[PDB]
Each structure stands twice: as C-alpha cells, then as structure tokens.
C-alpha cells in the first residue's frame, strides 16, 4: 500500500540478529533476552517483528539488515482509527 | 530538645541500671530529654500477668498511662514487653468504649481517670524516626568508632508483632535495627532464623525453664555459627534471658558460648564514650571483656 | 544541585565554610555579581544551610575540605 | 593586578569537565564544532553530533526537582 513492491516483513530474523540492544522478554517472564526488534516466540501468529521504541537506540542497523524488503520504519507514530 | 516521660519498668532499674543510665545520658546527647515518671510501677508484665487476668492487666497499664497523662507528656520506653503492655493497652482503650468504661470505673476507686491523650514510643523507634533524632544524628553523636566488631541483633517479638497491630513494617526480615548498629560503626551480621523468640515471653521463663532455655539455645547456636561478638537487644526480658540463660545453659546443658549481651542503649553509650564502669557492665552474668578488648 | 549536611553537634562556628564556599563568594568577589544567594550562614554558633531546596551547591568540596574538624558530609547522590 | 583563572587552548580537549564542575554562573563558555571519526556515519550519529555541539555554560540555582545532578545553561 505504501508503495514498496518488494514486500514488508517475512520474519527472516536478520534485524534481531544485528540489533545490539538486549532486554528481558515478557513472554518468558523475563528469564530470556530479546533484542529491541523482536518476536515473543517463534510461533507468534503475525510473524512481523515489533520494534520496542522505549528501548531502541535508532542505531539503524536493523534497516540495513532488512535491506530491500524495507519493512522497518523507525519514525512510525501511534495511528488512530475509528470503527463502528 | 523533645521531652518524653521515661517509663523505666522493672528489669532495667533493678537488674541492669547501666541500661537506664546510658539511656538518659545518650538520649540527652542527641536531642531527647527523658523525664522520670512519678510513681510508675510494673507495667503489668504482658505474659506473667496478662495470662492471669486481662482486666487487671488493663487497669494497671491504664494507671501507668494516666500518670504520664497528668504529666502531659509522651511515654518513652526501652523494653519490648513494656511496650506491649503500655502501648497496646493505650491503643485498645483509645478505641474500645466498654473497656474504657470498665477501666474507668475501676480507676475511680483511686481518684484517677483515663482519657487517651498521649502516645507511647520505644526509644529505638525515636532514634530511628527522622523528625526526632535520626540515624544521621546517631552517627554524628558517635565518637568512638566501635569498628571491627561483629554484632548480632535480636529484635524480640513484642515490639514488631503482630504487624496487623503495629506500624513498624515487615516482620520477616527487618533491617532498621541493623541500621542503628551500623550507625555505631559495628558491622551487624545476619544469622539463621534471626526473628526467633528468645523463649522468655509469656511466663515460660518461669513455668518451664528447660523449654525456655532450649528455645534460647537454638538462637545462641545460630549466633555463634554466624560469628557474633555480642548480641544487641531492645528488651530487658530478652537481655535477662540471653544473660542468665547462658549460665543456666552452661550448668543444665554442657554448652559454652560466652557471648556478651548488651542493650542498644549500652552500646550507644560505649560509642559515645561512656565508661564500662559508668555502664555497670560488671552486673552482667557474661563477661563483656573480650568485646571491650575488640572495640577498645 | 547537591545536598550538604552539617553535623551541628561538633560545629564550632569557625565560619571557614561560609568564607570558603565559592557560591557565597559570588556576591562581593565577582565583577557584576550574578546571583546573591548564600548556602551557609553561622547562626547561634553553628553553620546553617539556607539552601534548603538544594538548588545552588555544585559539589565543589571547597567547604568539606575547609572545615578544620571534618563535620560537613557532601552527598553526591540524588536526595 | 592579576587574572584569577585562564586556559591554554593548545591543551584543552573540549571535554566539558570544567563546565560541569564550576560552581560559578557563566565563567566558562564551551562549544564544540567538529568531532573527528573513522567509520562512516549514522542518523543516530548525526543526532549525537547535534547534541554534542550545542553551546553550554555554568549555572547557579538550577531547578530543585532534579536535585542530585547537574543542569547547565543553554546558550543561544
Ligand atoms: S523486519 Fe525485515 S529483517 Fe526483520 S524479520 Fe522482518 S523482513 Fe526480516
Ligand atoms: S534501530 Fe533499534 S531495533 Fe534497529 S538495530 Fe538499532 S537498536 Fe536495534
Ligand atoms: S560543595 Fe561547593 S558550592 Fe556546594 S556548599 Fe560546598 S563550597 Fe558551596
Ligand atoms: S567550617 Fe565546619 S566547624 Fe566551621 S562553621 Fe562550618 S561546619 Fe561548623
Ligand atoms: S576541563 Fe576540559 S574543556 Fe576545560 S580546559 Fe580542561 S580539557 Fe579543556
């Protein structure tokens, strides 16, 4: 929709392979590390790799790892929708 | 200089007078003024007298409270059992109307009424509060470091428990009394089951001395294993148990510890420079001389 | 914006914590004085810190280094 | 008569400890213009350049809500 033909997120994992931030995983009740860009577990239904903006340092390594897929938009903001 | 009526129950004046002497001196050195209570008696000791008759327990504790009420002052205490009696009867009779009535018509035979106008404080509680002398003020007043001494704290039971009836917070692992010992410069150590009863409460000290001494010996074993060089305490009951009971343990059992037992006021006096003779450390069953060699 | 605590019990009124503070020395000893507020003033023989809300100190340690019988503790951690 | 303080610009490395330590009002004026790096760049590094390159000076009577730390003056 935004115009990137090559696609969005396919869940490859390169972004979290290169992210340098490491934070606790709330799915694992904090026992396990997860990067700033992450999925809870490998069986999440939308396999889309959220970015944790409270902990991201905007280093930009994730976008270079994502490459032509261009799925990462580090400047995204809270959008509001009204549904009847 | 805050002023408090000094209740001074039975054991501190009549067995360990250095405790009360150091109480007055150290409290005056920090900003506290301890005034004698005029004709106070035994706070009806909560175990040995509450076990017999709760109504006379109420009446005697209320008489002790109305002495300081006429003095128009706040009670200050140095005993956990006296705290139980005085503070808890004050709290109960500030809220229970039929008990107020009963105690008042008992006290009317001696021209004396309870109205519930004052508050009861433990001296260590005052030393810990920030409005009154705080931990920093205690550190300021300390003039002899007392460094290089391992000191084990015994909280007792009647000061902090039950926590649904007091306001000192956690009873499972409090650290406030450990901060007062750390202010003096002595390092407080932690031992197994540090919140265990000493065994002297409830009249067990008198009824079954062997049972009480076994409860005490469990503590003494844990404290020696930790490696303490003295046991600080905030109760003359607990001090009497830990002091006499070491001798009775040495005779009834075959266990030797020789661990000095000192009230926190006695340690505060030692920190502030009072002499061992002026503290009457010769009146304890267990010699304090090794601890004095270490901290002096 | 730190917090200084003066042990009133051993303060002698020497006034070498008032004279040596470089924020006190701003009023009379600066060209075109910027701020004329003072951390300490010795009232009744002991040093009183007027800087109640911890806005003017700069953790210099000139006052801790000045008191002859150490009595000023400087706190470098948020109050 | 004499000066009370001065600096040697040959040896100053534009660190900022002097500004962070001075209890005065605006004795010191610090402004860095260019950091010298190896490695290419990043949007994060441009943000960090913008943060490091704002001029600063001492301040007396900073806000109490942040007591326990330092706050400098933003120079226009
Ligand atoms: S955001 Fe990009 S790099 Fe990360 S999993 Fe999705 S497609 Fe792969
Ligand atoms: S921009 Fe954020 S998510 Fe991407 S690599 Fe840097 S810290 Fe990780
Ligand atoms: S640390 Fe420096 S600025 Fe703060 S009160 Fe002491 S002398 Fe004054
Ligand atoms: S320099 Fe020390 S002793 Fe003198 S007034 Fe200040 S705090 Fe008190
Ligand atoms: S403190 Fe830093 S900025 Fe100031 S003169 Fe020294 S090196 Fe230069």
Residue A12: which residues within 8 A CB-CB, separation 6 or more? none
Q: What does the block give as tokens for D15?
A: 């660190």
Q: List the structure tokens of A79.
A: 């959008």
* Under 8 Å between Cβ of B18 and B283: yes
- C37 close to D71: Cβ distance less than 8 angstroms: no
Distance separating alpha carbons of residues B296 and B3, to the nearest angstrom = 32
User: d(Cα D73, Cα D76) in Å, to the nearest integer?
Assistant: 9
Residue of C nearest to D58 (CA): C58
- What length does chain C have? 79
Residue identified by tokens 């004095």 is: B292
Buried b (16+ CB within 10 A) or exposed e, C11-43: beebeebbebbbbbbbeeebeeebeeebbbebe
- Cα dist. B212→A80, B158, B178, B208, B247 in Å? 71, 17, 25, 6, 13
Closest CA of chain D from A59, distance in Å: 6
Residues forming beta bridges with residue B121, ordered by sequence position: B76
Q: What are phi and psi of B188, to 5 degrees?
A: -80, 135
- Going by their DSSP bridges, the two strands B74-77 and B150-154 should be labelled as unpaired
Task: Tell me the C-alpha distance between B189 and B222, whole Å.
Answer: 11
Distance CA C33, CA B198 (A): 65
Solved using: cryo-EM
Q: What are φ and ψ of residue A6, in 5° steps? A: -60, -20
The answer to whether the beta carbons of residues A1 and A7 sit under 8 Å apart is no
Mutation pick for ligand 5 pocket among D5, D8, D10, D14 (CB with most ligand atoms within 8 Å): D14
Alpha helix segments (H runs only) across chain A: 14-18, 61-66
Cα angle value B156/B157/B161 (rounded, 5°): 140
Q: Are B241 and B216 in contact (CB under 8 A)?
A: yes
Spatial separation of the C-alpha atoms in residues B4 and B37, rounded to whole Å = 9
Nearest residue (by CA) to ligand 1, atom 7, is A9
Whether the CB-CB separation of B6 and B37 falls below 8 Å is answered with yes
Handedness of CA C9, C14, C18, C20 (dihedral sign): negative
Which of C34, C35, C79 is opposite residue D67, by nearest beta carbon? Answer: C79
3-state secondary structure (DSSP) of residue D73: strand
Residue B162: asked if its preceding bond is cis (omega within 30°), the reply is yes
Which tokens hold the place of B71?
Answer: 């003095």
Beta-carbon neighbour count of residue A70 at 10 Å? Answer: 16
Q: Which of C48, C67, C70 to mutate to test the pocket of ligand 4 (most atoms within 8 A of CB)?
A: C67
A61 CB contacts (<8 Å, ≥6 apart)? A18, A19, A20
- Annotated domain spans of chain C: 1-79
Structure tokens given for B30: 């920090």
- Whether the CB-CB separation of D17 and C59 falls below 8 Å is answered with no
* DSSP string computed for A27-56: TTTTSSEEESEE-SSTT-SS---EE-TTT-
| CB of residue D13 inside a 6 A radius of ligand 5 | yes
From residue B182, alpha-carbon distances to B109, B292, D55 in Å are 49, 17, 46
Please state, in angstroms and rounded to a whole number, the distance separating the CA atoms of residues B225 and B213. Answer: 18
- How many Å apart are CA B234 and CA B84, to the nearest integer? 13
For B185, the token pair is: 């410069």
- DSSP class of residue C5? E
Q: Work out the number of other CB atoms within 10 angstroms of the CB of residue A21.
A: 16
B2-123, CATH topology level: Glutathione S-transferase Yfyf (Class Pi); Chain A, domain 2 (1.20.1050)
Distance between CA atoms of residues C37 and B230, nearest Å: 50
| Longest Cα separation, chain C | 38
Residue carrying the six token digits 């660190």:
D15
C-beta of residue A60 within 8 angstroms of C-beta of residue D44:
yes
Query: Can you name the residues that pair with B232 across neighbouring β-strands?
Result: B153, B262
- Residue A52: CB within 6 Å of ligand 2? no
In angstroms, rounded to a whole number, what is the distance separating the alpha carbons of residues B208 and B18?
29
**How many residues are there in chain D?**
76
**Residue A71 CB contacts under 8 Å (≥ 6 apart), including other chains:** A7, A8, A9, A10, A49
Cα separation, D16 vs D8, in Å, equals 14
Contact (Cβ atoms closer than 8 angstroms) between residue A76 and residue A9:
no
Question: How does strand C3-6 pair with strand B261-263?
Answer: unpaired
* Crossing angle of the two packed helices B176-183 and B264-272, in degrees rounded to 10: 20
- Alpha-helical runs (H) found in B33-175: 54-71, 80-93, 97-107, 123-128, 135-141
- Cβ of C8: how many Cβ atoms within 10 Å? 15
Residue (of C9, C10, C39) closest to C24 by Cα position:
C39
Q: Are strands B2-6 and B32-36 parallel, antiparallel or unpaired?
A: parallel
Please choose, from the candidates B24, B16, B33, the residue with its C-alpha nearest in 3D space to the C-alpha of residue B268.
Answer: B24
Residues with Cβ < 8 Å from B263, sequence gap 6 or more?
Answer: B12, B16, B19, B22, B78, B232, B233, B234, B236, B239
Cβ of B136 under 8 Å from any chain C Cβ? Answer: yes
Q: Alpha-carbon distance B128 to B8, whole Å?
A: 20
Provide the residue count of chain A.
84
Distance CA(C17)–CA(C50), nearest Å, equals 13
């Amino acid at each position: 929709a935004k115009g990137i033909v090559g696609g969005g997120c396919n869940g490859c994992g390169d972004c979290s392979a290169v992210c340098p931030v490491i934070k606790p995983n709330p799915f694992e009740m904090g026992m396990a590390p997860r990067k700033a860009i992450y999925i809870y577990h490998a069986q999440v239904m939308p396999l889309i790799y959220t970015v944790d903006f409270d902990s991201c340092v905007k280093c930009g390594l994730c976008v270079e790892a994502c490459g032509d897929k261009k799925a990462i938009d580090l400047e995204m903001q809270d959008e509001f929708i009204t549904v009847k | 200089m805050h002023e408090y009526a000094f209740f001074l129950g039975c054991i501190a004046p009549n067995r360990y007078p250095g405790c009360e002497a150091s109480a007055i001196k150290t409290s005056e050195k920090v900003g506290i003024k301890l005034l004698p209570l005029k004709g106070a008696s035994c706070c009806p000791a909560p175990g040995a007298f509450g076990s017999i008759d709760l109504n006379v327990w109420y009446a005697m504790a209320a008489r002790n409270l109305v002495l300081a009420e006429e003095m128009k002052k706040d009670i200050a205490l140095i005993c956990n059992g006296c705290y139980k009696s005085i503070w808890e009867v004050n709290h109960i009779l500030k809220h229970n109307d039929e008990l107020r009535d009963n105690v008042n018509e008992v006290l009317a035979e001696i021209d004396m009424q309870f109205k519930g106008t004052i508050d009861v404080w433990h001296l260590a509680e005052l030393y810990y509060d920030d409005k009154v002398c705080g931990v920093q003020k205690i550190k300021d007043s300390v003039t002899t470091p007392l460094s290089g001494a391992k000191v084990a704290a015994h909280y007792g039971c009647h000061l902090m428990k039950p926590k649904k009836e007091r306001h000192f917070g956690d009873t499972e692992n409090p650290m406030w009394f450990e901060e007062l010992i750390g202010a003096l410069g002595a390092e407080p150590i932690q031992y197994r089951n540090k919140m265990q009863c000493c065994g002297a409460g409830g009249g067990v000290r008198g009824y079954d001395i062997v049972h009480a001494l076994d409860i005490t010996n469990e503590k003494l074993i844990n404290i020696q294993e930790a490696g303490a060089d003295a046991i600080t305490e905030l109760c003359p009951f607990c001090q009497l148990q830990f002091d006499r009971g070491q001798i009775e343990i040495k005779e009834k059992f075959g266990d030797v510890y020789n661990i000095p037992v000192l009230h926190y006021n006695e340690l505060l006096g030692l920190a502030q420079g009072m002499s061992p003779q002026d503290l009457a450390l010769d009146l304890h069953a267990i010699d304090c001389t090794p601890f004095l060699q270490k901290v002096l | 914006a730190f917090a200084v605590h003066v042990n009133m019990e051993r303060c002698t009124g020497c006034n070498n914590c008032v004279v040596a503070c470089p924020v006190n020395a701003l009023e009379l000893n600066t060209v075109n004085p910027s701020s004329t507020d003072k951390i300490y003033k010795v009232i009744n023989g002991d040093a009183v810190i007027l800087d109640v809300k911890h806005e003017l100190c700069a953790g210099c340690g000139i006052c801790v280094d000045a008191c002859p019988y150490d009595v000023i503790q400087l706190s470098g951690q948020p109050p | 008569i004499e000066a009370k303080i001065a600096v040697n610009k040959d040896f100053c490395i534009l660190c900022g400890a002097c500004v962070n330590a001075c209890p005065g009002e605006d004795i010191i004026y610090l402004r860095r213009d260019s950091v010298k790096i190896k490695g290419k760049e990043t949007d994060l590094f441009k943000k960090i350049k913008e943060k490091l390159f704002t001029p600063r000076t001492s301040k007396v009577k900073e806000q109490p809500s942040l007591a326990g730390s330092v706050e400098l003056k933003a120079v226009s």
